[PDB]
A paper describes a structure:
Tpx constitutes part of the bacterial defence system against reactive oxygen species (ROS) and, correspondingly, is upregulated when E. coli is exposed to oxidative stress. Atypical 2-Cys peroxiredoxins are functionally monomeric, in contrast to the typical peroxiredoxins, i.e. the resolving (Cr) and the peroxidasic (Cp) cysteines (C61 and C95, respectively in the case of Tpx) are situated on the same subunit. Tpx contains three cysteine residues, two of which (C61and C95) form the redox active disulphide bond. ypTpx has a regular thioredoxin-like fold: a seven-stranded β-sheet, with β2 and β6 running anti-parallel to the rest, although with an inserted N-terminal β-hairpin (βN1-βN2) absent from other peroxierdoxins.
Crystal forms 1 and 2 grew in conditions containing DTT, and the solved structures were in the reduced state. Crystal form 1 diffracted to 2.00 Å, and the structure comprised three dimers in the asymmetric unit. The six chains superpose well, with root-mean-square-deviations (r.m.s.d.) of less than 0.5 Å. As there are only minor differences between the two reduced structures, with an r.m.s.d. of 0.4 Å over 160 Cα, only the highest resolution structure (space group P21) will be discussed here. There are no salt bridges or covalent bonds between the two dimers in the reduced structure. The redox active site of Tpx is made up by CP and CR (C61 and C95 in ypTpx, respectively). There is a conformational change between the two states, involving the partial unfolding of helices α1 and α2, and a shift of 8.4 Å for C61 and 5.1 Å for C95, respectively, as presented in Figure 4. The partial unfolding of α1 opens a cleft in Tpx formed between the loops connecting β1 and α1, α3 and β6, and β7 and α5 on subunit A and connecting β1 and β2, and β4 and α2 on subunit B. When in the reduced state, C61 is orientated into the pocket where it is available for oxidation by H2O2 or alkyl peroxides. During transition to the reduced form, the loop containing G59 to C61 folds into the binding pocket predicted to accommodate the compound. Collectively, these conformational changes reduce the overall volume of the binding pocket and are predicted to affect the binding of ME0052 to the reduced state of ypTpx by inducing steric clashes. In fact, MOE Dock as not able to find a suitable docking pose for the reduced state of ypTpx, presumably because the binding site is occluded by the folded extension of the α1 helix in the reduced state.
Residue numbers in the entry:
A (entry chain B): 1 to 167
B (entry chain A): 2 to 167
Amino acid sequence: MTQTVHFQGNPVSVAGKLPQIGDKAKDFTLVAKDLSDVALSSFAGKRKVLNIFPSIDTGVCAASVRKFNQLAGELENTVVLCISSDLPFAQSRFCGAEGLSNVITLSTLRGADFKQAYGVAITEGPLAGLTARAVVVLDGQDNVIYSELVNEITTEPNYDAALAALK
Amino acid sequence: TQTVHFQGNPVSVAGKLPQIGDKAKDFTLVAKDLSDVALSSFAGKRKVLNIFPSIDTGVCAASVRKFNQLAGELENTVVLCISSDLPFAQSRFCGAEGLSNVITLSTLRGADFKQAYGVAITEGPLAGLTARAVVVLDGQDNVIYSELVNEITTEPNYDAALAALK
């Protein structure tokens, strides 16, 4: 049913279960910056860092996208996917403004059942309808090699543990 | 359904834009602070609903800045800028541009608004967004003007919209 994360300590309900090491991750379809629909299966044979966050237009989500963008640079055989409920238009504005060329931004504009399938759908309170903060790392065939449902939404995910799984 | 266009290409929009004489449906949308704001909260005020695809595209942005300059001369009126942008996008924009008169609302929640107001882009690349539309409401939520813009890359008719307020 639900996971519990927090916002400045206040409990926030998140539906489903974040995928765990060993699970087969579900194929999903999300909206890329040209408004085309992009399936996880398009990335077959590459590893995938899914950096999931509430919104690129808030501060800690923006920090995680700069960070992963800088880290994507020296990753081997990996795509870094920045995923949220932002419209594709916000996401590309931010990456265009900040010179963040490595990440691929994807929106739940369409393909929203993703939130449900990846256990990141906030279901209650002022954040209901946004994704929680999470990192999922997937191998070339979409097996989970790492995941972290960030306990406190006002803190950044653990970048080093996430990318360790790629080594 | 209804058809409008984007660079000449038909785009279907579900529902039917309310027409003069109709009682507009009571919506609840998401304001900048993530609180849920009902149309009824604006009782006794006229409302200009500026509905567009996204504030982070150029035509939508031009209409928010125009309605915002026009909003300052309006009597007994609130100007609601409505889209499927997240509240955060709407707030970033209005704060960066000094656009302090409009009230932004998002379909983050309260998404039945799109259907109820005949503005839900149904198929194609724009699916999940609102079409471009202006609905003007009286103090009691009757429709005094509406336009479903025929071509999405053109601005709405500001002057006709606001005439209905005089």
